[PDB]
Amino acid sequence: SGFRKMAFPSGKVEGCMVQVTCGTTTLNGLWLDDVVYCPRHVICTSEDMLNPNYEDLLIRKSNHNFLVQAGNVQLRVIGHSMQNCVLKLKVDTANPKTPKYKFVRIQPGQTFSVLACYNGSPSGVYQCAMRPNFTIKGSFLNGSCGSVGFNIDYDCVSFCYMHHMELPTGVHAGTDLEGNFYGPFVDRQTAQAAGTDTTITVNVLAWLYAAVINGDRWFLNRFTTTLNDFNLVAMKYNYEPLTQDHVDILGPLSAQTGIAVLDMCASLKELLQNGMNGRTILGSALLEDEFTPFDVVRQCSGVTF
Amino acid sequence: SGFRKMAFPSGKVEGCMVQVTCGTTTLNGLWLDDVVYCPRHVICTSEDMLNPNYEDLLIRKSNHNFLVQAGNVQLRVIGHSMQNCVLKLKVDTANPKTPKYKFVRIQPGQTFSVLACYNGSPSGVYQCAMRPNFTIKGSFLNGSCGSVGFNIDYDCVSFCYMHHMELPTGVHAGTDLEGNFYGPFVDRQTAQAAGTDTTITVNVLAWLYAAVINGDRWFLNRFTTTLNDFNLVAMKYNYEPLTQDHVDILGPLSAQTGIAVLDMCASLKELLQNGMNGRTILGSALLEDEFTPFDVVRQCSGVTF
Ligand SMILES: CC(C)C[C@H](NC(=O)[C@@H](NC(=O)OCc1ccccc1)C(C)C)C(=O)N[C@@H](C[C@@H]1CCNC1=O)C(=O)c1nc2ccccc2s1
Numbered sequence A, B: 001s002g003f004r005k006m007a008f009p010s011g012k013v014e015g016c017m018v019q020v021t022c023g024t025t026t027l028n029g030l031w032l033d034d035v036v037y038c039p040r041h042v043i044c045t046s047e048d049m050l051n052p053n054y055e056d057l058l059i060r061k062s063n064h065n066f067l068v069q070a071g072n073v074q075l076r077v078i079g080h081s082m083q084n085c086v087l088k089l090k091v092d093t094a095n096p097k098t099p100k101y102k103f104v105r106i107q108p109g110q111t112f113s114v115l116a117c118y119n120g121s122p123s124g125v126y127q128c129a130m131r132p133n134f135t136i137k138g139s140f141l142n143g144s145c146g147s148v149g150f151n152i153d154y155d156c157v158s159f160c161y162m163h164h165m166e167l168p169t170g171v172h173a174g175t176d177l178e179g180n181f182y183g184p185f186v187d188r189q190t191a192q193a194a195g196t197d198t199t200i201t202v203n204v205l206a207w208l209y210a211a212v213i214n215g216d217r218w219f220l221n222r223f224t225t226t227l228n229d230f231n232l233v234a235m236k237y238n239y240e241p242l243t244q245d246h247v248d249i250l251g252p253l254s255a256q257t258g259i260a261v262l263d264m265c266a267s268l269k270e271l272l273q274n275g276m277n278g279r280t281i282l283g284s285a286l287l288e289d290e291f292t293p294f295d296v297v298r299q300c301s302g303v304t305f
């Protein structure tokens, strides 16, 4: 037992990280087969970033302008192209460490692991969620751009995020691996802000189920509720509406614990209206919404890769 | 910016994990050079665990009784010996993926990453601290024994923990890689419990420094305190006494933020006496004590490996 914030094993993604330098700028790239993916602003100076004309900047670059380093081995760039906000560098050597992989665009509420890298070297791994306002609550310093977010399903690494920028209040924004941003943001140093965020209701419920599985049960009340009455209450407290899709997704945890989803909704409703009275749930003093139902199941089932 | 609970990249340790089977029992082993380390109770049945006579059980085993699997490759055991609570299996093949490594015994208050494994396959990675009562707050199911805890300093993996057992209230106990338990526990299924735990004061202070580095500053008061007066207060609230060694260790964060350690102690003293008034620090509603000063520095400096 026990419940911890848990990342995927990062080794498969570690063997893919390289360092990309174009003139003054150095960030991280993702090396799969004979292609390296990195943020397109690798071609920017600091002055360039205020309002970059990316096409104009890229025509002034040759293949030899891009210094790609894997370990202490320089990779020769033999082609380059721009796809949305990402740069694709064909290299003359396929990565022998390439895992089975795919590129996916995740939905708000879903989680992934981030391998935070600097100068193409892995620094650490942490878990976060795509927030409803299409930001993530990351930990990123100068030089972290090109770090990626991923899930592992079986033996396949599903890359879903590449890091580009930091936004007001210290939250973060990035793209899928086709270069399309999550949210309405652009890769430009001009004032922009995320919309108001919301709590990921289905994840809170999954986390209450994890609490029950671990014997932390004090908040279970004796009542039930309809889906509609629950959503009227949750809306007041800035919680996402719970959908039937969400109810379905919670089915396995409901069956494991023998608590119907709408009963657990009744217990969350009392927690929102009354607070937790200085008490904790799984060692936390507020309600956690960055564990999906799949995260809870995987962790309370020992799913391996 | 941003501050997350962050694990070390786990790839170096992933390439060391194997599956050890002796008769009915299967758990995880650590393969370095031509030796596999695992918990000695791999030789126990369920009845055996109530009061195992480990020497008697081991004489009844040959090398061929131990099935060691790395991937889909069986490793031939050519020797075996018992060292305290750990079994050492010499195999005829050195692990080609062996990293530079060492075995260390960590102190209470220090942190490490856990690579949680089942059937020799990595499930996930998380960070935890050696508690002052020599337990860890882990996440471990049946079959997790032999999972290890580690730090990475430069390119060297410092193995410090191997998982053995779960204790009342869902906390965990294990050994260093020489088989000596942390704390007074034994690898036997008989009632035992950890002593009362304490808050790791130096880590709380490190975490308040991280908060300031990230712009979360509301709790900084205008006062100071002596080391002695601080410790009189902290003792009341079950906080470890702060030593001069601890003050020294906090030096870098003090210099980065320009807040003297004893001033930050004054601010923690007011937090302990008055509470946090429904407010949060780095998104947490209680004081966190599982980030060391080194963790804060490494994370707010981007140290890579
Ligand atoms: C071109 C932009 C995308 C670069 C990117 N800008 C922002 O993140 C700004 N954000 C921002 O302008 O938002 C809009 C805004 C809001 C309010 C006011 C003004 C502007 C932030 C630093 C202020 C940026 O520095 N990326 C970093 C990761 C960054 C570093 C710090 N924390 C993070 O995660 C990355 O590693 C990269 N380094 C370089 C260095 C040279 C060249 C390229 C890159 S790409």
Ligand SMILES: CC(C)C[C@H](NC(=O)[C@@H](NC(=O)OCc1ccccc1)C(C)C)C(=O)N[C@@H](C[C@@H]1CCNC1=O)C(=O)c1nc2ccccc2s1
Binding pocket: A001, B025, B026, B027, B039, B041, B042, B044, B045, B046, B049, B140, B141, B142, B143, B144, B145, B146, B164, B165, B166, B167, B168, B172, B186, B187, B188, B189, B190, B191, B192, B193
């Ligand atoms: C021999 C002991 C060390 C085994 C070890 N016992 C305890 O952990 C008991 N603890 C305990 O008896 O404390 C003392 C106590 C306190 C109060 C009352 C009675 C007894 C717990 C399950 C109750 C144990 O099952 N290790 C697990 C990890 C475990 C599994 C669940 N969460 C965890 O972390 C491990 O993977 C292993 N599996 C097997 C399976 C077969 C053979 C060996 C092993 S080794």
